[PDB]
Design a protein around this ligand. Structure first.
Ligand code: MG
Ligand code: MG
Ligand code: MG
Ligand code: MG
Ligand code: MG
Ligand code: MG
Ligand code: MG
Ligand code: MG
Ligand code: MG
Ligand code: MG
Ligand code: MG
Ligand code: MG
Ligand code: MG
Ligand code: MG
Ligand code: MG
Ligand code: MG
Ligand code: MG
Ligand code: MG
Ligand code: MG
Ligand code: MG
Ligand code: MG
Ligand code: MG
Ligand code: MG
Ligand code: MG
Ligand code: MG
Ligand code: MG
Ligand code: MG
Ligand code: MG
Ligand code: MG
Ligand code: MG
Ligand code: MG
Ligand code: MG
Ligand code: MG
Ligand code: MG
Ligand code: MG
Ligand code: MG
Ligand code: MG
Ligand code: MG
Ligand code: MG
Ligand code: MG
Ligand code: MG
Ligand code: MG
Ligand code: MG
Ligand code: MG
Ligand code: MG
Ligand code: MG
Ligand code: MG
Ligand code: MG
Ligand code: MG
Ligand code: MG
Ligand code: MG
Ligand code: MG
Ligand code: MG
Ligand code: MG
Ligand code: MG
Ligand code: MG
Ligand code: MG
Ligand code: MG
Ligand code: MG
Ligand code: MG
Ligand code: MG
Ligand code: MG
Ligand code: MG
Ligand code: MG
Ligand code: MG
Ligand code: MG
Ligand code: MG
Ligand code: MG
Ligand code: MG
Ligand code: MG
Ligand code: MG
Ligand code: MG
Ligand code: MG
Ligand code: MG
Ligand code: MG
Ligand code: MG
Ligand code: MG
Ligand code: MG
Ligand code: MG
Ligand code: MG
Ligand code: MG
Ligand code: MG
Ligand code: MG
Lengths: 114, 209, 123, 54, 119
RNA sequence: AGGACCGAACCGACUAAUGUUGAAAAAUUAGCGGAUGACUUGUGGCUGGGGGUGAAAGGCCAAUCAAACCGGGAGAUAGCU
RNA sequence: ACACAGGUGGUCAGGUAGAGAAUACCAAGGCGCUUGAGAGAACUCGGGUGAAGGAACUAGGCAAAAUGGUGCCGUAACUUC
RNA sequence: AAUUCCUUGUCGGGUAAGUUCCGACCUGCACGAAUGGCGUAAUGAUGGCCAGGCUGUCUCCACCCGAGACUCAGUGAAAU
RNA sequence: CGAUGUCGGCUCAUCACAUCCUGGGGCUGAAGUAGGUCCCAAGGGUAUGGCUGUUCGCCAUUUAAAGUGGUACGCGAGCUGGGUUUAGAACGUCGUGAGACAGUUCGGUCCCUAUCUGCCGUGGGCGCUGGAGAACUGAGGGGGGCUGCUCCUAGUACGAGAGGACCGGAGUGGACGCAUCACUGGUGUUCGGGUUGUCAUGCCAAUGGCACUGCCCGGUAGCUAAAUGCGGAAGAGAUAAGUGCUGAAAGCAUCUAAGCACGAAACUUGCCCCGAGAUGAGUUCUCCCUGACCCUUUAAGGGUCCUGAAGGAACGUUGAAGACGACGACGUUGAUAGGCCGGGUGUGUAAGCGCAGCGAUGCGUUGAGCUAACCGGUACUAAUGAACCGUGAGGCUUAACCU
């Protein structure tokens, strides 16, 4: 509907970069506490991207301190400030969920050239 | 107060300066128009009857087209009626603008439901099902027992069993309006108003807020 | 989303490393507890010597759920282990003094301002 | 699932009342071969609204 | 419940509901009109006509794709030689249903399904 | 070498779901036990109602068992419906 | 008693895998099992999948899930070796 | 204890909790020595109990594909 | 006794009030806090486990509360069969024995399509007295009502301290319900891929069949809840216990006899739903028919002819409506479905070609190819000119304006 997609192009942003599955993503989330509002990083592989225009998302996974953390985002939301790629890889899938039960040396993704 | 009639088209979300993801929905509301004004001496009660939308010429019927041209309006699609109170001045030819909700914080929305067919006893009234194992034979989902023995010796009136699920008029109240649209004739209300999309709902200021 | 008979890992230094929930508290017929709740646990497998032995009965708090917490923006935060932090039946504040792993931001309040100082990552 | 009386012809007809099969209300006619085929159906000849199909 | 769905079950399983429509689509392109029942011929529609919309644009790979659709060496050559260019201007709709009453031993409401071209 | 083991034919029938005017007046589908031995099986012959046969449950003896099936005394007798 | 998802002894033994008369697809050969065409409800029979927890179910892990082959390293109390 | 009524006898492990289980006491209502005592490696489609693995058994049931049940056409029963 | 299946669990309740919680008042050996005990109050709510066949019971642990009872100690034409209960077997004990024993362990077939009353849903005929298309007024009915805790007042009053409120406000959660799917996920044998074993398409490549989708990994729209929005109200009236005001009977005290005021989740409303088959059959703005006659039924009667309109039914395309009916949209003036172009979305560099290499394989064209329902589009296909039903001023009495 063009009554949906007339207001689903006002809320969106034009400052989102491009990434495939299987790469490390640096995400700067804004965080409130008290009166200060300040940035906080996030860094891990991304294993699930969902493309729904305004409703798009992805999932970042990192083994922080032993307790493995997954976290989905809302791509066109004002809680994310900026997103950067850091090292892009080459997986032949696009829902990497075998990187859930797998830790350490054998849970790698090899580098992508070009 | 003077209600209006909309059509629910989709569901989306308005974001904030902070990052709240407010659920919201878009009921398109064109400018409704007064069709028949009643009062006590004319009919028996003060009210207003209106109609918005569009209907084809070769399927508006000769009873309806006479009522249309008796007023002077276009070929709308419905006929809805709103009760009223005193302290108002009204005519018939004037059409109601879409900005009547532009100063009310909490509204009410009534409409139809969805049609879930001939339902079940585990599905409509939430009867907890029984053992799917452990000896039990051919009674996994039945509603069990329904009456006593011999005194009454009958199934009481008011019992709940299988039947048609919903598909009637339901009401959600006190909802949150966030934004109007003078440009493309919308109402953005927070939540999930009843009925499937492609249906027409009756919106009003909330009766108690 | 922790119910009865849920086997939890222990986040802190207080000797236990495998506990089992037995009740959830704070309202009748309750089924689920996420962060910020006070479940009641036994203790099933301690270390050789620690502050609490096997078979104690003492309250706790769930700090890291695999079902995840849900932010205002709809974003979820999920973990990879159901784990809790021990407590004390008469003080509602912990027994050990070092908290491993990260804990979530949605726990901070002046009932629980002591597990947000030790935790190395308030997520 | 066992009856206790023998009911009557009155109740049998009262159930059999709603069996009211009606016939076709009216047929319809061609414009190049002229028979009374069914409405929205081909003829036995093979005609439909002018065309002779097979 | 069945809300907003598609497809039709037609009282056969789904190792049957492709192996039947292979033979039906292997006969319709052969004889350009056949006599079969009405739910089997209202939904043979979109099984035969995208097979012709694909065959409109000749290639080498489509001679394997429609070979996967049909498994008949005769019908792939005829579908890409004759029935390709003969409808190379319409925006679809290469079929037409004509109701032909009922049937003898089962009261099966039949139909005549055809291409638009016989004359 | 085995009154050996895992396992198809073959023999048996432990549990559960189907079904109990069902496809069958005792079966079918997924599982089970034995499976060169005190085994299983085709043919023929032997035993006989107070008697036969029994690795013993009053079991089985022509879909019938604490005394079979058929004819006769017998139209047994009945304080009971 | 049915043109019965029942039962009944012997003879012959093809390919590619496979320990093999098991099993999966096949050729030689045979059949689609004598009612159908539709719509895609409650419910029931037969089944595949499942987020968090993992026997809290119940008389009972009943049913279901799981393990599952060949080769090598290794293997506890107890004992009639 | 397959035999024990007063009984959920009495104590200790097992469990947060254990009328059943395993180990001791003997006040054994009414075990006991070929209608046998006590013991025991292996074995049992055996009785009773706990543990790891596993999951719709369950908290809590949701969806999916098939043979029925609902509609139209032919044949057409039964208990009462 | 020519048979009404019995205890306990599972599934569904409904009423009773001698009331467990929550609501309002009086007494206290009641300072506050918490309690004692009767009086009014039944709207609403009422634990998950261990153990035995068990209601109970004991124990572990919550909550505001873990109420008491009848209903064939509710409920086997609804479901387990463990208990007591058939056939086998054994121990104690009894009898010489056959076998017994509210003593005990072990294993032990729970049958049925609803005719009728009943109950939840969906429908056709007729009436509502001219006939049809709609929107409504609502006498009655029916679901709904719960409660925790933290914070303000205030560490106030009370109290020696220790402790620690009334009365009003602000927030957040569980149980129970109503919807919807945008967000997080679940299914997705109709959409992509990998992969084994085997036979064929002559063959190499390439694709398809079968073994639970052969085993898997992903997954669109829809259906769904664990996913997130809303509800329980506030107010008005007369009320139960109780406190009153004025005041005689009885010159004084007296809530009572006259009268006047207050009073709680119970009551009527207020919130919401199907709601004129309310026969007491309604109200209500609209559109259509303004022809001739003869026959005895002498007029509310039967028939021949142009008349057959309003409007509905039937038929075809069908749907976020659906068992079949029914409800809703479209019917060449028109997007109602299937098709088709451009897109989206899902999977993840298709085949073919050239290079590299012993070959598995990678690399380039290449984020390419295929694409279910999905949002905005296109008359190529399918929805036929008609025919069929419904009629021609509405019966009588009595009242009122008017020619
Ligand atoms: Mg529906
Ligand atoms: Mg249950
Ligand atoms: Mg059975
Ligand atoms: Mg079953
Ligand atoms: Mg009788
Ligand atoms: Mg559709
Ligand atoms: Mg035998
Ligand atoms: Mg047996
Ligand atoms: Mg078998
Ligand atoms: Mg063997
Ligand atoms: Mg052997
Ligand atoms: Mg004899
Ligand atoms: Mg016999
Ligand atoms: Mg005798
Ligand atoms: Mg004699
Ligand atoms: Mg006699
Ligand atoms: Mg005699
Ligand atoms: Mg036959
Ligand atoms: Mg047959
Ligand atoms: Mg059939
Ligand atoms: Mg179905
Ligand atoms: Mg499964
Ligand atoms: Mg699961
Ligand atoms: Mg999965
Ligand atoms: Mg248990
Ligand atoms: Mg089992
Ligand atoms: Mg299995
Ligand atoms: Mg014993
Ligand atoms: Mg004894
Ligand atoms: Mg005893
Ligand atoms: Mg003990
Ligand atoms: Mg002992
Ligand atoms: Mg003895
Ligand atoms: Mg002796
Ligand atoms: Mg044996
Ligand atoms: Mg246990
Ligand atoms: Mg069958
Ligand atoms: Mg049938
Ligand atoms: Mg029939
Ligand atoms: Mg009788
Ligand atoms: Mg009796
Ligand atoms: Mg009382
Ligand atoms: Mg008191
Ligand atoms: Mg009540
Ligand atoms: Mg009550
Ligand atoms: Mg009330
Ligand atoms: Mg229990
Ligand atoms: Mg037990
Ligand atoms: Mg109890
Ligand atoms: Mg009783
Ligand atoms: Mg009684
Ligand atoms: Mg009782
Ligand atoms: Mg009873
Ligand atoms: Mg009964
Ligand atoms: Mg019972
Ligand atoms: Mg028994
Ligand atoms: Mg019937
Ligand atoms: Mg009936
Ligand atoms: Mg009707
Ligand atoms: Mg009421
Ligand atoms: Mg969803
Ligand atoms: Mg959507
Ligand atoms: Mg799948
Ligand atoms: Mg193959
Ligand atoms: Mg090949
Ligand atoms: Mg084949
Ligand atoms: Mg298959
Ligand atoms: Mg997914
Ligand atoms: Mg989905
Ligand atoms: Mg009053
Ligand atoms: Mg006085
Ligand atoms: Mg006085
Ligand atoms: Mg209240
Ligand atoms: Mg009130
Ligand atoms: Mg159009
Ligand atoms: Mg189209
Ligand atoms: Mg396209
Ligand atoms: Mg993609
Ligand atoms: Mg491919
Ligand atoms: Mg390629
Ligand atoms: Mg490249
Ligand atoms: Mg691609
Ligand atoms: Mg469209």
């Amino acid at each position: 509907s063009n009554i949906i997609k007339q207001l689903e192009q006002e809320q969106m942003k034009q400052d989102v970069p491009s990434f495939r599955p299987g790469d490390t993503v640096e995400v700067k989330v804004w965080v409130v506490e008290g009166s200060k509002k300040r940035l906080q990083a996030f860094e891990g592989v991304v294993i699930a991207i969902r493309n729904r225009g305004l409703h798009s998302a992805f999932t970042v996974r990192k083994i922080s301190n032993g307790e493995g953390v997954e976290r989905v985002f809302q791509t066109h939301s004002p809680v994310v400030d900026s997103i950067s790629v850091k090292r892009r890889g080459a997986v032949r899938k696009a829902k990497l969920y075998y990187l859930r039960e797998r830790t350490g040396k054998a849970a790698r993704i090899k580098e992508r050239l070009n | 107060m003077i209600g209006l009639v909309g059509k629910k088209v989709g569901m989306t979300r308005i974001f904030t300066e902070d990052g709240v993801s407010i659920p919201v929905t878009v009921i398109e509301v064109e400018a409704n128009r007064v069709t028949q004004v009643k009062d006590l001496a004319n009919d028996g009660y003060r009210a207003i009857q209106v109609t918005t939308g569009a209907k084809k010429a070769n399927r508006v019927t000769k009873p309806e087209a006479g009522h249309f041209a008796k007023a002077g309006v276009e070929a709308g699609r419905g006929l809805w009626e709103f009760r009223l109170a005193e302290g108002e001045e009204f005519t018939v030819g004037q059409s109601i603008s879409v900005e009547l909700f532009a100063d009310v914080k909490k509204v009410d929305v009534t409409g139809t439901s969805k049609g879930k067919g001939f339902a079940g006893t585990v599905k409509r009234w939430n009867f907890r099902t029984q053992d799917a194992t452990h000896g039990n034979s051919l009674s996994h989902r039945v509603p069990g027992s329904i009456g006593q023995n011999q005194t009454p010796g009958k199934v009481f009136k008011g019992k709940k069993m299988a039947g048609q699920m919903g598909n009637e008029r339901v009401t959600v109240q006190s909802l949150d309006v966030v934004r109007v649209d003078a440009e493309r004739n919308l109402l953005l209300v927070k939540g999930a108003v009843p009925g499937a999309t492609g249906s027409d709902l009756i919106v009003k200021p909330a009766v108690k807020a | 989303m922790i119910q009865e008979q849920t086997m939890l890992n222990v986040a802190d230094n207080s000797g236990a490393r495998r506990v089992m929930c037995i009740k959830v508290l704070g309202g009748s017929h309750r089924r689920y507890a996420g962060v910020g709740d006070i479940i009641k646990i036994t203790i099933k497998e301690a270390i050789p010597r620690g502050k609490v032995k096997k078979g104690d009965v003492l309250k706790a708090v769930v700090v890291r759920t695999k079902k995840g917490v849900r932010r205002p923006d709809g974003s979820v935060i999920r973990f990879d282990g159901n784990a809790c932090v021990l407590l004390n039946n008469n003080s509602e504040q912990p027994i050990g003094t070092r908290i491993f792993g990260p804990v979530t931001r949605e726990l901070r309040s002046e009932k629980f301002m002591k597990i947000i100082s030790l935790a190395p990552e308030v997520l | 699932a066992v009856q206790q009386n023998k009911p009557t012809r009155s109740k049998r007809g009262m159930r059999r009342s709603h069996d009211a099969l009606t016939a076709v209300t009216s047929l319809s006619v061609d414009k190049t071969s002229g028979e009374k085929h069914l409405r929205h159906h081909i003829t036995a000849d093979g005609y439909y609204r002018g065309r002779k199909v097979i | 419940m069945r809300h907003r769905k598609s497809g039709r079950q037609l009282n056969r399983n789904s190792s049957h509901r492709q192996a039947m429509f292979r033979n039906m689509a292997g006969s319709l392109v052969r004889h350009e009109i056949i006599k079969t029942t009405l739910p089997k011929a209202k939904e043979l529609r979109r099984v035969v006509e995208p097979l012709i919309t694909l065959a409109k644009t000749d290639s080498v790979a489509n001679r394997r794709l429609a070979f996967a659709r049909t498994r008949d060496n005769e019908i792939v050559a005829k579908l890409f030689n004759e029935l390709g260019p003969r409808f190379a201007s319409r925006a679809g709709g290469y079929t037409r249903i004509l109701k032909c009453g009922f049937r003898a031993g089962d009261n099966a409401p039949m139909a005549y399904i055809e291409l638009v071209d016989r004359s």
